[PDB]
Amino acid sequence: ADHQITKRTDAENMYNTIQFLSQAPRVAGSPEELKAVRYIEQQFKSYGYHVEVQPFQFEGYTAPSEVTLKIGTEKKEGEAFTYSPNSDVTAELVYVGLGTTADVAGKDLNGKIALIQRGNISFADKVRNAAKQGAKAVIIYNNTDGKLNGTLGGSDASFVAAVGITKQEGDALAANLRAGEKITATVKVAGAEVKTLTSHNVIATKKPDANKKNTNDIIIIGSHHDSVEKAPGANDDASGVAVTLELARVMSKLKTDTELRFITFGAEENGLIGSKKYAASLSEDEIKRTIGMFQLDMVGSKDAGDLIMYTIDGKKNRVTDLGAAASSRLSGVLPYGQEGRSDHESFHALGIPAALFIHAPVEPWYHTPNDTLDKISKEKLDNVADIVGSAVYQAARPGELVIEPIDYPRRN
Ligand SMILES: CC(C)C[C@H](NC(=O)[C@@H](O)[C@@H](N)Cc1ccccc1)C(=O)O
Ligand SMILES: [Zn+2]
Ligand SMILES: [Zn+2]
Numbered sequence: 011a012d013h014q015i016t017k018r019t020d021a022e023n024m025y026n027t028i029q030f031l032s033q034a035p036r037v038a039g040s041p042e043e044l045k046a047v048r049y050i051e052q053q054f055k056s057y058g059y060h061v062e063v064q065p066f067q068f069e070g071y072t073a074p075s076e077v078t079l080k081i082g083t084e085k086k087e088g089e090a091f092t093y094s095p096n097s098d099v100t101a102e103l104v105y106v107g108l109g110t111t112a113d114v115a116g117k118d119l120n121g122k123i124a125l126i127q128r129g130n131i132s133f134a135d136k137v138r139n140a141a142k143q144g145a146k147a148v149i150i151y152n153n154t155d156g157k158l159n160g161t162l163g164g165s166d167a168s169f170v171a172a173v174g175i176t177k178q179e180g181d182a183l184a185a186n187l188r189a190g191e192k193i194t195a196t197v198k199v200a201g202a203e204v205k206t207l208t209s210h211n212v213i214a215t216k217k218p219d220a221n222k223k224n225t226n227d228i229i230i231i232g233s234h235h236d237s238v239e240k241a242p243g244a245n246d247d248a249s250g251v252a253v254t255l256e257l258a259r260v261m262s263k264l265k266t267d268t269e270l271r272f273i274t275f276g277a278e279e280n281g282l283i284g285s286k287k288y289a290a291s292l293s294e295d296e297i298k299r300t301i302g303m304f305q306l307d308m309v310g311s312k313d314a315g316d317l318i319m320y321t322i323d324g325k326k327n328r329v330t331d332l333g334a335a336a337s338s339r340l341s342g343v344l345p346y347g348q349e350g351r352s353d354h355e356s357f358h359a360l361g362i363p364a365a366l367f368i369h370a371p372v373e374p375w376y377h378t379p380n381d382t383l384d385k386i387s388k389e390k391l392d393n394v395a396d397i398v399g400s401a402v403y404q405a406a407r408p409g410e411l412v413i414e415p416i417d418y419p420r421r422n
């Protein structure tokens with residue numbers, strides 16, 4: 011049965027999809043993402059699919075024009091967290107540890123600037139916990155090398171300007187403060203803006219067309235069509251979109267007894283907003299009938315490692331079972347592990363079996379201007395299309411679903 015898939019997986023088609031999409035970054039809610047939505051819609055239609063476009067709004071963030079951080083007189087390097095309010099305050103710097111509700115409860119942060127170490131809780135809670143105590147600004151320092159780049163999740167007037175700094179420059183201040191030194195700091199954040207944007211999810215569905223063998227099962231195959239600022243997003247995630255489109259094309263040539271929904275989600279980089287919106291559109295019946303959701307994210311880089319399947323809880327499910335089965339016949343052992351960070355999380359949250367298919371360890375180009383077309387491997391795109399497509403087909407082909415017993419290891 012795999013031959014029905016492997017003989018039709020066109021790597022040139024997939025390469026071409028990535029070439030068109032990665033001509034420029036596709037920031038969620040931007041004209042470029044809209045352009046991608048129209049392109050994807052048109053390709054699905056060309057395969058003969060009926061397509062639906064689900065719109066949704068979300069709070070976008072415009073980075074501040076300038077982030078000025080100063081300890082007394084010396085100027086330090088700091089990057090304002092996304093969704094960070096604006097500020098122009100100069101006051102005493104107070105170390106409050108991890109910024110837990112307790113760490114700040116015993117301290118006097120009224121009108122002062124809090125110094126918080128990254129860890130345990132989310133950056134959002136730290137800023138929130140410190141702001142509730144009267145803190146006018148927050149300085150968070152790294153746990154590892156390199157700048158501290160994070161997000162407060164989304165807009166929230168309960169926040170106060172928050173900027174991150176390295177571990178070295180952070181442990182130093184914390185030490186000086188612990189030693190009893192009285193330090194003053196300046197946190198000026200200007201330019202930052204929050205705006206309401208509109209993104210979209212593209213949904214192409216193939217209804218079962220088998221004889222009396224039709225089931226009421228549903229399988230979802232997804233990827234996200236947006237990319238981060240400044241990143242052409244060839245592999246993250248035009249690659250996933252390319253495989254999603256090609257598999258949709260492949261399946262249109264075959265009879266199926268299982269409803270297939272090929273979807274490209276918007277605003278994934280903003281917090282899986284698109285997939286959360288689509289998941290919220292499903293009825294209780296659709297939820298219980300969805301036997302599996304396959305997420306394709308970063309599946310074409312020549313500079314990434316072997317293919318692996320990630321599940322939210324690190325446990326095996328119907329999707330990893332099918333993925334493992336297909337791979338055992340086509341390429342060998344396909345390991346599984348625990349990881350979220352992608353659209354599969356949105357379906358796992360509803361109890362639907364789900365897994366992320368990705369090449370790990372990931373390439374160094376991830377989220378950089380270097381995530382381009384010349385890093386893409388047609389051979390890997392084709393292999394993923396072969397494995398995921400055969401796994402889906404093992405279920406979608408006419409007849410009853412049978413999954414033979416096979417062992418596949420968990421990899422951390
Ligand atoms: C909650 C999400 C915004 C998480 C976010 N996800 C992404 O960027 C996706 O494009 C995925 N590429 C996340 C990812 C990266 C590397 C290995 C596994 C999973 C991320 O920061 O990784
Ligand atoms: Zn092929
Ligand atoms: Zn629209």
Ligand SMILES: [Zn+2]
Nearest residue numbers: 246247307308
């Ligand atoms: Zn991604």
Ligand SMILES: [Zn+2]
Nearest residue numbers: 238246279377
């Ligand atoms: Zn990403």
Ligand SMILES: [Zn+2]
Nearest residue numbers: 387388389390
């Ligand atoms: Zn080769």
Ligand SMILES: [Zn+2]
Nearest residue numbers: 016019392396
């Ligand atoms: Zn192949």
